[PDB]
Amino acid sequence: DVMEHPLVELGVSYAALLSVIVVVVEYTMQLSGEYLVRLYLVDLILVIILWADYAYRAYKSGDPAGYVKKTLYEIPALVPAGLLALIEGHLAGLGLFRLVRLLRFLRILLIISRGSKFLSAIADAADKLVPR
């Protein structure tokens, strides 16, 4: 009973674009708390939406396991931005600056990973509209 309704296909694709917008808003806009928390909630919902889609393609395509090992570059994007921010703050508060560095890099991978999925979304949208 796969709820693969076109209304879902539309959302999954539309989530890939919004997920990138999240990172841009986080980088550009100097959000503080209340408005910053709302941003991360939106991102969390988006990552879950994309969380499902990925697990789905995983199960079918030659069954789970095998698939994931080929699409690891897609994992970093599936990490909620608010989760990394939360972690970085906790790490800095403990003076674990060496780790803050690595967490920094993980954030870079998250951005690249979402950018990758961003391009796929656009390319796919172009196909549904003007097939080729």
Epitope: E88, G89, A92, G95, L96, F97, R98, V100, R101
Partner: antibody, heavy 118, light 108 residues
Amino acid sequence: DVQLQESGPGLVKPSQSLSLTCTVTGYSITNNYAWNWIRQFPGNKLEWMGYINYSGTTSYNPSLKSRISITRDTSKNQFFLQLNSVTTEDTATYFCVRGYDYFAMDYWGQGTSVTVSS
Amino acid sequence: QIVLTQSPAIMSASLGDRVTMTCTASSSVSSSYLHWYQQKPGSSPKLWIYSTSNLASGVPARFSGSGSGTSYSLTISSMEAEDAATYYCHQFHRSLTFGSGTKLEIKR
């Protein structure tokens, strides 16, 4: 070669505000770590006052919370200390210091003497 | 927020003597956050030993740090004239606090 240098008036009147500047060279205060203000009293007791880290968040000594403020100017790679309503007991040598991993203070400024007197 | 009591407050040792000083905490301190500093009159303190037992770059092998929980120590296998100074321990738990210091003098 990381280097910190403190600057500002060495004399302040009671009730007024004490302001010091730390200019850092050889490393960017926005890159990583904590940037502290630590003072040492005439009897040589050391006391951590607070810091502002690479991301701009501040942390203060609870006994100074209501009187202090640490800010920064990233374009000049400097951070500042402001201690309000100072009294005779705030007379001490003030150090700007870098807080490395686990808050080990690896680089200290040479320190500046501040006297609070009328 | 813990209090670090250093002992002895003041001590003197003959050049060549083994030297041991202690840092006692009011509550348990994580070994990764216990650091020692050496300071001589007229200059700023220098990181000497970090995370309980790691000697700072320029620090001679005669020095060593040990301990855990609420009890740490700094030892000098053999006292040299340049070791005369005041040593401070430091810790972080909820806040940053410094020990009362141990002033090491030369015995003659």
